[PDB]
Amino acid sequence: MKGIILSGGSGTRLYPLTKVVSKQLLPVYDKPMVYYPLSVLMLAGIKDILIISTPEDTPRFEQLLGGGSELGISLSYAVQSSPDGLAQAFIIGEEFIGDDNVALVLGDNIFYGHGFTELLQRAANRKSGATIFGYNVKDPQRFGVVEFDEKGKVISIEEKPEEPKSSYAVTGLYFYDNRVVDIAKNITPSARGELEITDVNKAYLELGELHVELLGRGFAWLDTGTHESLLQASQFIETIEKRQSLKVACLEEIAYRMGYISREQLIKLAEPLMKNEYGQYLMNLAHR
Ligand SMILES: Cc1cn([C@H]2C[C@H](O)[C@@H](CO)O2)c(=O)[nH]c1=O
Ligand SMILES: Cc1cn([C@H]2C[C@H](O)[C@@H](CO)O2)c(=O)[nH]c1=O
């Protein structure tokens, strides 16, 4: 499976932080926001990843993250000239995707919890259908909403219903079989002017192969939508990391733990960063 991080948008809520740059370049505590969703694809076992952003921000992501080789993966880049909807990732990424299965994650989504990598790996290893991930939120009318039965099978999915059928939002992480490319090419803009991911998921529902993984209350799916929520996300990460000796979404660590790079390669990554706490963390991991 390949992966895509959709990381543009004409985001304005966070002005003036985003006066120049896209939100996914902003810090969440001690690392750029984009590291979080990238870490999720990597933990899923996904090693070939396309990052899509605006004309002006795509080169900024490439300067930050590089070509992937340091992390034992492959990062590629494409431009979305206008934020015409999430489903457009699969049209921009047509050539990249080829005949393969593909996961999409949003560049501003942050997931965290015990047992999450088991779920990710399961979704990435599926050879047919789609997997979406549902999460209980306070104001579900503001999200895509997945309705399911007592056995956890999807009954419906609706984009920002005025009368939500459940309390479960459909989060910004999606795993698809290769049918997603032609599905994306066949749906039409909503009233919003957007090629809606909810429409892609409706198509998989109708095909009888939309699977939902319900993330319980022991998971965090953090809001980076406002200044207030960005700050709460930062504090959440700080708290988890301060207590343990352990980082959330440290890319070099994940590359080593996943077998993408060797202990030898991790040491070489740590060496030039030994003046800062981040390099020292990588070196400790190498030793231990
Ligand atoms: C509609 C749209 C949103 N986005 C981003 C902005 C937000 O971070 C997220 C959901 O709006 O997706 C894109 O990158 N491209 C798009 O076309
Ligand atoms: C092993 C490991 C897990 N994680 C995340 C995935 C889950 O959200 C949580 C528990 O495994 O920690 C990382 O961020 N980095 C890691 O190196």
Side-chain angles (χ1 to χ4, degrees):
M1 191 176 279
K2 282 174 188 170
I4 295 172
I5 304 173
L6 182 61
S7 191
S10 68
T12 160
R13 194 106 191 239
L14 293 174
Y15 187 93
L17 298 190
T18 52
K19 178 170 194 290
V20 179
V21 302
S22 203
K23 67 180 302 198
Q24 306 92 167
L25 290 164
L26 301 174
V28 173
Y29 184 43
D30 58 349
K31 54 212 92 79
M33 189 182 301
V34 75
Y35 274 38
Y36 299 88
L38 172 57
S39 78
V40 161
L41 298 185
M42 289 169 73
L43 286 164
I46 298 171
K47 293 177 76 175
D48 187 15
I49 295 170
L50 177 68
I51 302 182
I52 301 174
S53 188
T54 64
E56 332 83 72
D57 300 290
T58 303
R60 294 180 178 126
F61 290 100
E62 185 167 7
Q63 186 168 14
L64 171 69
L65 300 168
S69 77
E70 292 199 337
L71 306 171
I73 61 178
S74 160
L75 302 175
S76 289
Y77 297 89
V79 173
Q80 177 175 39
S81 48
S82 180
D84 288 343
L86 303 205
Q88 207 176 42
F90 304 107
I91 304 163
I92 292 164
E94 178 165 9
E95 179 91 330
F96 171 76
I97 293 162
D99 290 320
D100 295 308
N101 304 302
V102 64
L104 167 63
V105 66
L106 295 183
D108 62 359
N109 265 225
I110 302 174
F111 292 87
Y112 187 76
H114 173 67
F116 194 56
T117 129
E118 184 179 13
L119 274 13
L120 292 174
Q121 284 169 10
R122 191 142 91 235
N125 288 154
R126 273 203 197 255
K127 286 202 145 88
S128 178
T131 304
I132 52 170
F133 282 79
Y135 186 76
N136 188 274
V137 298
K138 189 178 175 308
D139 282 307
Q141 75 273 347
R142 288 168 80 254
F143 300 91
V145 176
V146 57
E147 188 190 15
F148 52 86
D149 69 12
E150 32 277 64
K151 313 204 148 231
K153 272 305 163 219
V154 183
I155 299 153
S156 79
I157 177 179
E158 300 185 340
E159 181 68 37
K160 309 187 184 60
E162 229 143 8
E163 306 201 305
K165 308 281 207 23
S166 79
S167 227
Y168 286 69
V170 181
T171 68
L173 172 70
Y174 317 90
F175 290 81
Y176 293 114
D177 73 25
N178 179 259
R179 291 178 291 176
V180 73
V181 182
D182 283 345
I183 283 168
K185 292 163 105 168
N186 282 314
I187 46 55
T188 83
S190 67
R192 250 223 278 214
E194 297 190 12
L195 301 178
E196 303 272 4
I197 204 79
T198 288
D199 284 359
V200 165
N201 294 334
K202 286 173 136 112
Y204 273 94
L205 181 49
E206 293 305 313
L207 287 166
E209 284 191 81
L210 175 72
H211 300 93
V212 63
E213 201 61 83
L214 268 352
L215 297 180
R217 67 218 288 167
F219 294 99
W221 175 54
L222 299 163
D223 186 0
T224 60
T226 59
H227 296 117
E228 180 197 338
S229 71
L230 213 203
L231 179 44
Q232 289 197 117
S234 298
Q235 289 164 150
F236 181 87
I237 294 303
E238 185 186 35
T239 295
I240 295 171
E241 294 191 340
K242 199 265 193 63
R243 175 60 140 171
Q244 311 198 64
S245 245
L246 302 168
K247 287 190 178 288
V248 180
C250 171
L251 306 175
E252 295 83 350
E253 165 176 24
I254 292 165
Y256 174 53
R257 282 183 187 279
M258 292 303 295
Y260 305 160
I261 62 174
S262 60
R263 197 211 260 106
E264 188 186 352
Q265 284 162 145
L266 180 66
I267 285 159
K268 291 187 291 105
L269 301 179
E271 282 173 338
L273 303 174
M274 289 299 293
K275 284 194 204 289
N276 63 246
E277 183 272 340
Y278 193 93
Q280 290 152 199
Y281 174 84
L282 302 175
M283 193 67 82
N284 288 343
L285 171 64
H287 284 172
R288 295 172 316 136

